Amino acid sequence: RNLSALKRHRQSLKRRLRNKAKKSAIKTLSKKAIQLAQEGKAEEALKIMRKAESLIDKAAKGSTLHKNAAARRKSRLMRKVRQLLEAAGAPLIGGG
Amino acid sequence: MIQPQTYLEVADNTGARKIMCIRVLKGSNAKYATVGDVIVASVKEAIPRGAVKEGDVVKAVVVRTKKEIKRPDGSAIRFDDNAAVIINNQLEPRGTRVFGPVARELREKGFMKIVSLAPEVL
Amino acid sequence: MVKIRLARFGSKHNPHYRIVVTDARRKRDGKYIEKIGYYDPRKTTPDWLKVDVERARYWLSVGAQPTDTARRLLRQAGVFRQ
Amino acid sequence: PKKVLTGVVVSDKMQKTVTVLVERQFPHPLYGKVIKRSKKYLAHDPEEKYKLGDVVEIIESRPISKRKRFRVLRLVESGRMDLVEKYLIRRQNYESLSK
RNA sequence: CCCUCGCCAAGGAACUCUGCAAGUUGGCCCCGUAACUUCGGGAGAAGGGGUGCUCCCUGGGGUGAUGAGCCCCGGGGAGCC
RNA sequence: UUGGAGAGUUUGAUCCUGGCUCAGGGUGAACGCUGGCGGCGUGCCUAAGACAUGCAAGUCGUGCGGGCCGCGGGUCCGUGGUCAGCGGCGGACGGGUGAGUAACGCGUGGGUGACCUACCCGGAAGAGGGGGACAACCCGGGGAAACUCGGGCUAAUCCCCCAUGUGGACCCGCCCCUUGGGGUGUGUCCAAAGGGCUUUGCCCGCUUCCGGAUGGGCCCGCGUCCCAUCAGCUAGUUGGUGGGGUAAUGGCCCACCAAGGCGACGACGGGUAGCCGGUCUGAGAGGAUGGCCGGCCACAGGGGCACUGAGACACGGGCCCCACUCCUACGGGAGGCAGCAGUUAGGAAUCUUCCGCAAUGGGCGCAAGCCUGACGGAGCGACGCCGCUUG
RNA sequence: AGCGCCGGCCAACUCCGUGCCAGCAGCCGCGGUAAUACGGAGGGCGCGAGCGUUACCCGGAUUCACUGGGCGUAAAGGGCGUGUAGGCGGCCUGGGGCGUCCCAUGUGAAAGACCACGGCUCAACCGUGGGGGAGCGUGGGAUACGCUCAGGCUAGACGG
RNA sequence: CCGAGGGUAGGGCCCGUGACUGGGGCGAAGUCGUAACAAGGUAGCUGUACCGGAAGGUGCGGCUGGAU
């Protein structure tokens, strides 16, 4: 009727709340920049995409994201903005 | 308001799932049983290898009724089903669990063991 | 981590450890990477300890960590000498 | 080494994928006689360049799909429609083994 | 009180010679469907899901001219009470 | 070339055919009769039925703030424990079991230009600024208890922001190579933590990148039982395009497109079964088997699920549904021995609620050390082999 | 110091009792009034802290026969054709090298097994060393036979 | 959205069980007849068919594993 396993569980929730919070923003700020790119609206898309890049890697600093998950998440974020902006171009500002 | 022919769910783990009242054990000629009354019933549907089988003539006590029962405080209570718990000739439940809520009237009628096994007394 | 360990053999009241490099999490008498010597803590026979020192230096050089008793059996064999 | 096998394209009816029918001979582990056995492989053809009767070589590649674990390597011989006829006749003969 | 008709708590054939009478079920579209069989059937077996309205996208036919318009068969997506 | 024995029984008698039977060896055995000792093995093969009680995983005060108690004085501080709390690391190892699985599960040989790996080792480079919360604690409510919610305070190797970029990542280019391998340039993006002593000095820690090493994931050829009185099977079904997902390939998952995939070389179905090193037999070939030991896999009351994390979809972690059981003050609550002993049930049948961490080994720690039913030993059983006695 | 056994197989025999009873029995079989076969006893044979039994695996079983069997009458030729798949296939030359053979090399964990030596007084148990393969990966080689491809023949086969 | 599972309805496979019923194996000394073994007193066997308390009988065609 006890353990140090109960402490590992109390901690797992402090981290779960923290990991879910970071992923929510990553998906929000990223998708936000992909809609903006489709409109394009390039300075606005790229000004947001960069904060989506920053949040991604800042998550890989710890346990929220593996290095490769972030690098793959970054790869698809940028790749979608390129083609989307190829229609109705003008990439200004710059981020690639 | 249970009478002969009335089907009742079985709110225990005896093995029986549906029983059909064949007698109201409350005098010479009671028309109806409510909660706390004992009936005699045949078992119409059992699950395999439970204590009671289909074809058994058992006693049970009604624990839930769809006809609302009235109380001296001016209130009433009604359940979605008609349900009973199977007993022996000592008011004691023949199973070890009671499923679903039961009426508080059972306590006054001396079906205490059922009241305790029930997950909610309303 | 890789560790340098004594996996007991022999029989009851009859110890005979093997000088073995094995994973830190492998069970004691389980499968090991290499056998680099042996040991007879009672010294009942002339050569109770022997060590392939050239090999024990490799695993020491590549990461493996000894035990507080395996270490004294590689120092007793001069794996650490100058 | 990535296993390399040689077989024949028995069915090209898919997009970017052909069916390569490979045979292999070996002695019976008890009766010593040499016996033939066969196996079909779904092989990748991203250029849809391979047709029925081609005698191709496949190389053990990374999964393209469930069951697709070989890429077609090189054409060795074209037009061996005699082998595909041995295959289809065998399959057609199966309706004769029914109840 | 009778006729014809509507509704009913809890029960649900306990009615009665008999579920008599009356409920239930009920069209269309789709899914699906048993013993047995003379291979047709049994079959609408059973059992289920769907059904209004709005906007948007779209496939074929008839008339016409190949088009518009009128008209007939559909398909997909998103909504509303 | 180290290896090969047969006999009884059909007839009045014979020869042949053929079945039954026997002599041998073996067992996790059991049963009867009998029973002295020692050693080393070994002992729930059935109900993966149900379980009383204890124990089987913790550790760091050299990360941090605290309540207590004891020690030296100035009711303030050092210090020693001590207790819970926050923060580390371990808890994914080790230990059990054989249910399920006829499968890339296992064996064997290979693939990864489709991949991850904490701690360990080696090489490169760095630690500069600022802020914040939550438990402990105080205050309030509820309760039999399990035990909570409320408000407010507070530290840190906890948490964010800025900076620096040795460096790495990503996108678009060119170069080598050739499945996503390696280079480089432009843009963008990401580092941190401090603690101890003897102190212009070490030590344990921290951060980013590379390599090693070990441990894995995934994929493929091949091998793997009985029934054909199971002969046809298939809609995520087979392939394609796009995407989601992951460390990573893939129908693994989703949309749409195409009409495919499989099968007498036995598909599909039904039965049984964890598989191998090996074990037992055998002249060999072969047959039988997979307990002990080692490797791998699978499961942790029956199912589903994810979270935390290098790593689990986690036996002694969490959520939910079911079956069962238990406490209760009757309002409500709890549990998961296929860990080690032990109990009960079933069965022809299968052990001590023992001892110690001294050894080996594991975890944490600067270290003294602490935990360790792993283990090392002791106990019961002619169960087995070996040795010994009753002269 | 006990347990099994003493008709043949199969090692060990007499007396009594019983009288198709009581019983034995792995098989063939024993017992119906002189039983080495039932029961006891004497004696004897085999083992010995064991000895018997039951269950099960392999062997004997060449009784699933690859090694290593059969089918007129013992069990066994399909009632007979035709033909699909499949198995198998004449003589000569060459190209390849799939089978097949050889050499090299990697893998084949530890334990076990086997041989040598040693430690527990021996042994069981245990340590240390030695020696191997098959199978598969790779590199090199051989080409008789089997395979394939190509060319020629006429003895099989088919046609005039 | 998926989703353990719960519910409703309809199939398939297997196991056990059932009044009664079919024949089968076995069982020291039952009852009936005598089919087969000799030319077994009707040569036998045979596929089929029909009949009869029972073996069997008879038809058709076939075999010699039929005697003299």
Ligand SMILES: [Mg+2]
């Ligand atoms: Mg959002």
Ligand SMILES: [Mg+2]
């Ligand atoms: Mg990371």
Ligand SMILES: [Mg+2]
């Ligand atoms: Mg209920």
Ligand SMILES: [Mg+2]
């Ligand atoms: Mg119930």
Ligand SMILES: [Mg+2]
């Ligand atoms: Mg029952």
Ligand SMILES: [Mg+2]
């Ligand atoms: Mg019934």
Ligand SMILES: [Mg+2]
């Ligand atoms: Mg009851």
Ligand SMILES: [Mg+2]
């Ligand atoms: Mg209650």
Ligand SMILES: [Mg+2]
């Ligand atoms: Mg001892």
Ligand SMILES: [Mg+2]
């Ligand atoms: Mg491991």
Ligand SMILES: [Mg+2]
């Ligand atoms: Mg109405």
Ligand SMILES: [Mg+2]
């Ligand atoms: Mg009304």
Ligand SMILES: [Mg+2]
């Ligand atoms: Mg009514």
Ligand SMILES: [Mg+2]
């Ligand atoms: Mg009603």
Ligand SMILES: [Mg+2]
């Ligand atoms: Mg009703």
Ligand SMILES: [Mg+2]
């Ligand atoms: Mg009803």
